[PDB]
Amino acid sequence: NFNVLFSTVFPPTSFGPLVRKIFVDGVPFVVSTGYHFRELGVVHNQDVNLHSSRLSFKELLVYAADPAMHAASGNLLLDKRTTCFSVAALTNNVAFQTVKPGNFNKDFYDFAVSKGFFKEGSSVELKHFFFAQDGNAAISDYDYYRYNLPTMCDIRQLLFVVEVVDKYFDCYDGGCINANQVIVNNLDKSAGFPFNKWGKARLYYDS
Amino acid sequence: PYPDPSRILGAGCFVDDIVKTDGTLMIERFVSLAIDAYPLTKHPNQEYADVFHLYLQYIRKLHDELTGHMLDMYSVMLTNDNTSRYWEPEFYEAMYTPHTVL
Amino acid sequence: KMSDVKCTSVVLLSVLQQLRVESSSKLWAQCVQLHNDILLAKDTTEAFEKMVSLLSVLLSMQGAVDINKLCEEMLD
Amino acid sequence: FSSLPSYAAFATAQEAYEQAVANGDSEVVLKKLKKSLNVAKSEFDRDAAMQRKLEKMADQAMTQMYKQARSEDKRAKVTSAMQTMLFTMLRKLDNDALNNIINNARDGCVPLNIIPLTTAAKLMVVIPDYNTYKNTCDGTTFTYASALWEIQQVVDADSKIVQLSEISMDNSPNLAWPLIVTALRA
Amino acid sequence: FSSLPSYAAFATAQEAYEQAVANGDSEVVLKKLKKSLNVAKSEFDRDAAMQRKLEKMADQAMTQMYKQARSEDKRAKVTSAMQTMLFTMLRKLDNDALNNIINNARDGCVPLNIIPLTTAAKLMVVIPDYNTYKNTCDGTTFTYASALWEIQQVVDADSKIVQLSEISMDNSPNLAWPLIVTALRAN
RNA sequence: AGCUGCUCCCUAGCAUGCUACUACCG
RNA sequence: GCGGUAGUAGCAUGCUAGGGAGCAG
Ligand SMILES: [Zn+2]
């Protein structure tokens, strides 16, 4: 709670991952080794090793998900459409994504009109549709994070509310489980950047 | 519980794929949408029960028009293997009565 | 008669979309605005003038849909 | 399914036992038909089952094939069905302004930009021959989309001004004809 | 399933029963050669029903290890993909500006948000309207983030090249209007 | 191109369970 | 005459797996 108040004073380029240079068989990388949170302070990793020999499947998986080497090798970006902090541009051009209209099932509509629907003054009418969007739809929707502001709490009131709220959750039981006990519905969904260049979640749960 | 009638009718008229604009290819979409619309039959407003009745009539029409294709374009005689339960109200009334079958 | 104008607007925007109109960003923006404002109208005198201006777009692109045989296939 | 081989055997056994119960002599000489017969129902119900559900399996395979064929041939014809649909729907709407602009476009007069709605703002229309110029433009007032527009400037296909009273019958074969009128809404 | 050890045995039992049926002598003819047949019952039940289970289990096993071989190949494929990507983005990175800022850090660590801000060679700006254009990057060189930049190329929302003379207050309504400016760091 | 929950339809399989016919021994 | 087991056929209930679809946050 105190960190939230004190962190509004310091420059916003000082928060985020902290990077370092390591060597993989004599070739230098740039990887994350910590984090500076606005709420939790400075955190340092416990297993960091310069000069490793190879990379397993797991270490490649961890280095590919890191934003360190994606952002350290792109262009600088000054996006003036938002007030949010922009970091880097990962290509040479901007992408403008649209949304399409719906499809009209004319057979059902004709059948329904031959049974007396959609008359003048009826109580049932059409108000649900597929609305279309133009190229500036994604960034204008991302710009709604300007409503998130730093909020400091009444701490002595919160430390009591949390106990009562915890009393609401007493009948359940939890804990950790192993990898052969977890259940996935629909292993045919996306894996999410950069992993959607090579397969779906099935590929990574099988490999 | 019952839904807004405009939601069900809109799910009938507007779709997100061109294949779903032919009814005889799926039919199950309309069976599910008719499950969702059964409790409107008990409403005091008469233009609300007509939605459930319209769905049942459309399901029957689609079944007939699918079966009357295999007898002409081909020479296949389809038998009504108890597919007549879908255009009667008992199959749908059973989903809101307390004795499960999930 | 409001229902018909709304359904026709949906079909119109589908035709315009598959005629490769979103390769011009300003034209596509105007078309999307007209479509979305027809779908929200509550007065059948605005919807028809907006439909007039939205069909003018397809009629501008001469040499992309052949207007004659379509109007003579059976229906106008 | 009765045209099957073991039908004859089963029918023979059951007719023999019908005779045996209509004669009623022994208990195991009549059990002959039953030691003899339960074999008939062990080789007729064992063969009047597999083909009976095979009859349904075949019909369900052919319905699946038909559905895949129809599904794949529906999405190879989107941009002909869509335009045919649009024009039937526009015909049954039966609006005066839409019919005006559609008939004009069918005979040659098309716009060059979106039709404006404000009482200000400009409209440009291509006019391809004298005959279609008679019906719409008379004086300095234009009749289009069931409205009235006031002419401001006419230029030729040579991109040079032509004064308005020049356009008439005799001088029509003197101008590269696809002119462009420019009008503002009244 | 005909080359089993008991096909011959049930065959000879029924063949002797056929021989005696062509004979038809005694009550023991019936009893015996329905029990020569009624012994060759277990043969052709277990030897033709345990042979009907081992084969299903063998097919199960073969299909399963087919699956495992394919899953083992796709793993190597994706491993190669990830390695090539990492080593490819490695070679736009190892400059001297990077080492210069890294060696000025007291313990080796730096924030990640200041690496493109201080070492990148190219800048991209996205402009919503002309009023913003006048206040950010008018001219042919401008200063951003404590450095000097030099414009090369301007494109619009359709990815078409604009020339710097067209961008004006009265030509503004004729442009597709997010413009994207590309500049290079001046030395 | 996400995370969850519920419901309908179709096929495969497993054991189980009920039920019917044949054989053997007791 | 009955029991036990071994086979073969038909029927239900439950569980798992796979595919198709619908709604809600
Ligand atoms: Zn734990």
Side-chain angles (χ1 to χ4, degrees), chain A, chain B, chain C, chain D residues 4-14 16-17 20-22 24 26-186, chain E residues 2-14 16 18 20 22 24 26 28-29 33 36-187:
Chain A
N1 209 45
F2 278 114
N3 278 338
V4 152
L5 174 66
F6 296 152
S7 264
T8 66
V9 173
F10 310 135
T13 30
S14 43
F15 306 98
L18 311 171
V19 294
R20 192 172 269 154
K21 199 152 78 161
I22 67 148
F23 294 85
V24 182
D25 268 44
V27 189
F29 275 28
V30 159
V31 293
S32 304
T33 50
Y35 214 104
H36 185 201
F37 300 91
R38 280 175 147 101
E39 291 95 0
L40 308 179
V42 175
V43 178
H44 284 294
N45 279 3
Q46 274 173 300
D47 298 322
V48 182
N49 46 352
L50 330 317
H51 311 269
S52 34
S53 57
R54 281 233 86 171
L55 296 188
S56 15
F57 200 75
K58 176 205 122 185
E59 293 155 63
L60 285 162
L61 202 98
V62 162
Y63 287 171
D66 224 306
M69 278 222 97
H70 290 96
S73 82
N75 313 318
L76 187 59
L77 179 75
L78 178 51
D79 201 318
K80 302 248 82 204
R81 301 175 292 178
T82 48
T83 42
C84 293
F85 194 105
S86 36
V87 179
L90 264 41
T91 39
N92 263 318
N93 33 58
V94 181
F96 302 92
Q97 213 210 321
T98 72
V99 185
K100 315 196 312 268
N103 296 89
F104 182 42
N105 191 359
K106 188 201 235 260
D107 188 6
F108 184 64
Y109 182 83
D110 289 349
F111 189 81
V113 170
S114 68
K115 261 79 178 46
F117 281 74
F118 315 130
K119 271 211 245 283
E120 284 71 4
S122 210
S123 9
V124 182
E125 56 169 59
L126 295 170
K127 321 170 324 204
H128 289 70
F129 304 100
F130 284 83
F131 290 88
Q133 317 286 339
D134 69 338
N136 307 314
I139 204 88
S140 101
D141 194 79
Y142 177 75
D143 195 55
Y144 284 141
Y145 275 115
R146 62 184 193 257
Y147 296 138
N148 201 272
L149 313 171
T151 313
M152 178 179 202
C153 294
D154 189 336
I155 188 59
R156 295 284 178 233
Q157 173 195 88
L158 192 76
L159 283 171
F160 177 88
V161 168
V162 66
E163 303 301 322
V164 186
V165 165
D166 186 51
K167 212 96 208 319
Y168 270 90
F169 278 88
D170 267 4
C171 44
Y172 319 112
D173 76 307
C176 298
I177 53 175
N178 279 305
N180 46 297
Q181 315 183 276
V182 326
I183 285 152
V184 192
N185 320 273
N186 213 349
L187 270 183
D188 262 278
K189 306 228 151 283
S190 97
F193 204 84
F195 303 103
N196 53 12
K197 310 185 176 310
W198 309 303
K200 307 250 142 155
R202 211 186 280 281
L203 177 62
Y204 303 97
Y205 264 103
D206 287 0
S207 314
Chain B
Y2 67 91
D4 181 12
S6 328
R7 219 292 182 186
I8 312 295
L9 283 176
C13 304
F14 302 110
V15 293
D16 48 307
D17 195 34
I18 192 85
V19 152
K20 315 176 152 165
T21 55
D22 198 341
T24 58
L25 303 187
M26 269 138 69
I27 307 197
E28 67 248 4
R29 283 210 340 132
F30 297 89
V31 168
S32 269
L33 285 163
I35 276 179
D36 275 320
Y38 167 78
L40 292 165
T41 7
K42 311 273 251 191
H43 214 269
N45 197 331
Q46 190 58 34
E47 309 172 321
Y48 281 38
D50 299 341
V51 186
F52 183 70
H53 295 292
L54 167 83
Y55 268 85
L56 269 44
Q57 270 146 33
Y58 193 60
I59 288 171
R60 197 214 183 120
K61 181 202 162 223
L62 284 179
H63 261 305
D64 273 3
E65 162 192 337
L66 160 76
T67 214
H69 254 304
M70 326 283 273
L71 262 78
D72 290 276
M73 197 30 201
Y74 323 107
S75 306
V76 173
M77 212 214 81
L78 295 204
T79 67
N80 189 358
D81 289 345
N82 204 32
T83 51
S84 100
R85 64 203 256 241
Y86 292 143
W87 62 74
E88 276 132 36
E90 302 96 50
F91 170 93
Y92 309 88
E93 183 184 350
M95 298 276 317
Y96 293 91
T97 312
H99 210 190
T100 100
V101 82
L102 29 115
Chain C
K1 197 37 128 73
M2 264 282 263
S3 296
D4 309 359
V5 82
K6 302 195 166 166
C7 297
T8 317
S9 85
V10 175
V11 174
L12 185 35
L13 198 67
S14 297
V15 167
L16 279 182
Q17 187 263 131
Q18 81 203 4
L19 270 186
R20 292 272 84 72
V21 160
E22 30 188 348
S23 95
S24 163
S25 65
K26 11 178 40 217
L27 204 53
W28 181 246
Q30 309 190 46
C31 291
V32 165
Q33 179 94 63
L34 287 160
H35 162 269
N36 279 8
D37 273 27
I38 293 167
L39 281 191
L40 287 164
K42 274 150 316 203
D43 179 43
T44 198
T45 200
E46 309 169 16
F48 271 110
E49 44 151 281
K50 291 221 253 289
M51 268 272 306
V52 161
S53 99
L54 179 76
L55 175 75
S56 66
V57 172
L58 174 85
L59 297 175
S60 292
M61 298 169 343
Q62 196 145 57
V65 90
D66 158 80
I67 168 67
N68 253 288
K69 37 161 318 180
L70 267 160
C71 213
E72 171 265 287
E73 166 142 15
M74 295 300 293
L75 294 208
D76 179 325
Chain D
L4 287 81
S6 60
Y7 181 45
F10 173 48
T12 294
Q14 71 100 332
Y17 197 53
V21 302
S26 157
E27 71 251 10
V28 203
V29 195
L30 314 194
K31 229 183 275 156
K32 217 42 170 295
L33 322 159
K34 201 57 61 237
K35 279 329 241 357
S36 325
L37 198 138
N38 283 38
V39 190
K41 315 223 64 144
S42 74
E43 172 110 353
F44 197 81
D45 304 349
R46 212 222 50 239
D47 271 341
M50 77 170 339
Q51 60 84 267
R52 167 44 214 167
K53 299 175 279 220
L54 256 46
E55 162 269 13
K56 259 146 26 184
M57 173 225 75
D59 277 347
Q60 264 219 51
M62 264 178 22
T63 318
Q64 190 230 286
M65 282 206 282
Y66 153 85
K67 251 140 48 161
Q68 185 182 4
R70 267 233 83 205
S71 146
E72 208 32 65
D73 296 22
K74 206 177 145 93
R75 59 166 56 109
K77 293 182 157 73
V78 202
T79 98
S80 275
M82 202 65 84
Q83 310 179 333
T84 308
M85 175 139 70
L86 166 71
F87 272 85
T88 74
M89 305 195 48
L90 268 166
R91 178 193 190 250
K92 92 162 155 64
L93 260 190
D94 181 357
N95 190 234
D96 250 21
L98 294 165
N99 281 267
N100 188 348
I101 73 181
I102 289 178
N103 288 336
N104 263 326
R106 168 213 287 261
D107 85 23
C109 308
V110 283
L112 296 149
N113 39 313
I114 304 189
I115 292 185
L117 303 170
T118 93
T119 306
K122 196 226 317 187
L123 176 92
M124 264 164 318
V125 172
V126 158
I127 283 194
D129 66 85
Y130 183 54
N131 251 24
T132 190
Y133 184 83
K134 326 201 53 139
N135 320 325
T136 87
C137 316
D138 158 53
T140 90
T141 67
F142 192 40
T143 28
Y144 196 62
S146 106
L148 288 149
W149 320 67
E150 63 209 356
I151 309 202
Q152 258 143 40
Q153 175 210 7
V154 187
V155 313
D156 222 339
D158 308 343
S159 89
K160 61 103 213 186
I161 299 263
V162 43
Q163 226 70 59
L164 182 75
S165 148
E166 172 41 308
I167 310 165
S168 87
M169 334 187 161
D170 56 342
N171 261 346
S172 46
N174 304 32
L175 319 89
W177 247 110
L179 305 127
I180 285 145
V181 193
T182 306
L184 205 100
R185 195 181 216 153
Chain E
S2 77
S3 309
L4 306 119
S6 316
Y7 203 33
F10 155 68
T12 180
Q14 90 90 34
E18 180 222 280
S26 54
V28 82
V29 156
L33 279 155
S36 289
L37 278 197
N38 236 322
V39 138
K41 154 229 117 44
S42 41
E43 301 323 282
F44 263 43
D45 198 291
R46 207 73 47 271
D47 208 350
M50 203 45 63
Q51 191 107 354
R52 194 202 333 261
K53 184 219 87 208
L54 291 199
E55 305 334 288
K56 267 185 77 291
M57 90 152 191
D59 183 27
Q60 305 261 308
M62 269 261 299
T63 305
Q64 145 80 342
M65 47 199 223
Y66 270 121
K67 274 191 227 263
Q68 207 191 346
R70 270 153 245 191
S71 107
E72 226 163 56
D73 211 316
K74 274 170 330 204
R75 169 175 163 129
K77 236 182 65 152
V78 75
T79 289
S80 272
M82 284 190 305
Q83 255 174 6
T84 292
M85 179 220 204
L86 280 184
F87 280 70
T88 277
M89 59 197 339
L90 226 63
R91 71 169 92 281
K92 317 153 70 169
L93 164 90
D94 198 27
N95 359 283
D96 55 346
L98 193 77
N99 311 288
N100 239 325
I101 71 138
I102 282 272
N103 297 350
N104 283 324
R106 193 201 326 81
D107 42 340
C109 254
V110 294
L112 168 68
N113 282 339
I114 59 108
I115 284 172
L117 205 59
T118 56
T119 73
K122 177 189 281 165
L123 171 65
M124 289 177 45
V125 196
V126 196
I127 309 277
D129 49 27
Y130 173 79
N131 175 263
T132 309
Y133 187 89
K134 274 206 55 33
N135 303 260
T136 297
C137 47
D138 67 330
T140 172
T141 72
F142 58 104
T143 96
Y144 172 70
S146 197
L148 202 82
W149 306 86
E150 189 210 290
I151 296 186
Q152 68 154 221
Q153 210 195 57
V154 179
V155 302
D156 56 24
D158 287 300
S159 272
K160 232 62 74 184
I161 284 151
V162 181
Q163 310 277 343
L164 282 150
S165 62
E166 316 177 15
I167 310 148
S168 95
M169 172 94 273
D170 48 311
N171 202 58
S172 108
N174 309 346
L175 302 168
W177 239 125
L179 307 181
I180 304 120
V181 181
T182 306
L184 253 49
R185 209 186 266 264
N187 315 314

